[PDB]
Amino acid sequence: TEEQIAEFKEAFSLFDKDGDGTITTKELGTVMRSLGQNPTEAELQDMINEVDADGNGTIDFPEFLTMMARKMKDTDSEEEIREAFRVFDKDGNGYISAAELRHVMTNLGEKLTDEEVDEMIREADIDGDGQVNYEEFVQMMT
Amino acid sequence: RRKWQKTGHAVRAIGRLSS
Ligand SMILES: [Ca+2]
Ligand SMILES: [Ca+2]
Ligand SMILES: [Ca+2]
Ligand SMILES: [Ca+2]
Structure with a gap:
C-alpha cells in the first residue's frame, strides 16, 4: 500500500538530489563520494543501466520501486x-x-x-x- | 521505522548493484 509508497519515496528522495524523479550518475556518484570512496561515471552507469527499463539511463521511480519491492534472481x-x-x-x-x-x-x-x-x-x-x-x-x- | 527504512531501501540498492 501507501506506507511502502512513502517509504520508497523517502528512499528515492535520499538519492535524488535535484527533484525531477530521475537519479542520474552525477547524483549517484555524489552519494558514493559523500559516503567515502568515489567511483567514476562509467561505474555508476553500470549500476544504473542494469535496472533501466526505458533505456534513458537515469533510474526512475517505477524502476527504483520495481528493483527494491520485488524479489531478486539469486x-x-x-x-x-x-x-x-x-x-x-x-x-x-x-x-x-x-x-x-x-x-x-x-x-x-x-x-x-x-x-x-x-x-x-x-x-x-x-x-x-x-x-x-x-x-x-x-x-x-x- | 521510517528513518532506518529509507536508508535501508537505499543502502541495499548500493550493495546489490556493486557487489
Ligand atoms: Ca535528479
Ligand atoms: Ca563499529
Ligand atoms: Ca529509466
Ligand atoms: Ca545490542
Missing part, C-alpha cells in the same frame, strides 16, 4: 544485508554504534535531532548494550 538478499552492515559499521568489528549511525545519516543527508538518533538505535537494539549486531539487524531489515 541469493543476493543475503549480501544486501551484509553490505548494509558494512556501510554502517565503519570499523568492521561487528557492532554498530550511535556515532556510525550518525555518520551514515550525515552522509546520506539527514540532519537528526539527538532524540531521533536515540529513538532509532533503541529500536534496533534488542538486548540493551546500545550496539546493533547482525542478528538485531536481520530482525530490522528483513
Whole structure:
C-alpha cells in the first residue's frame, strides 16, 4: 500500500538530489563520494543501466520501486544485508554504534535531532548494550 | 521505522548493484 509508497519515496528522495524523479550518475556518484570512496561515471552507469527499463539511463521511480519491492534472481538478499552492515559499521568489528549511525545519516543527508538518533538505535537494539549486531539487524531489515 | 527504512531501501540498492 501507501506506507511502502512513502517509504520508497523517502528512499528515492535520499538519492535524488535535484527533484525531477530521475537519479542520474552525477547524483549517484555524489552519494558514493559523500559516503567515502568515489567511483567514476562509467561505474555508476553500470549500476544504473542494469535496472533501466526505458533505456534513458537515469533510474526512475517505477524502476527504483520495481528493483527494491520485488524479489531478486539469486541469493543476493543475503549480501544486501551484509553490505548494509558494512556501510554502517565503519570499523568492521561487528557492532554498530550511535556515532556510525550518525555518520551514515550525515552522509546520506539527514540532519537528526539527538532524540531521533536515540529513538532509532533503541529500536534496533534488542538486548540493551546500545550496539546493533547482525542478528538485531536481520530482525530490522528483513 | 521510517528513518532506518529509507536508508535501508537505499543502502541495499548500493550493495546489490556493486557487489
Ligand atoms: Ca535528479
Ligand atoms: Ca529509466
Ligand atoms: Ca563499529
Ligand atoms: Ca545490542
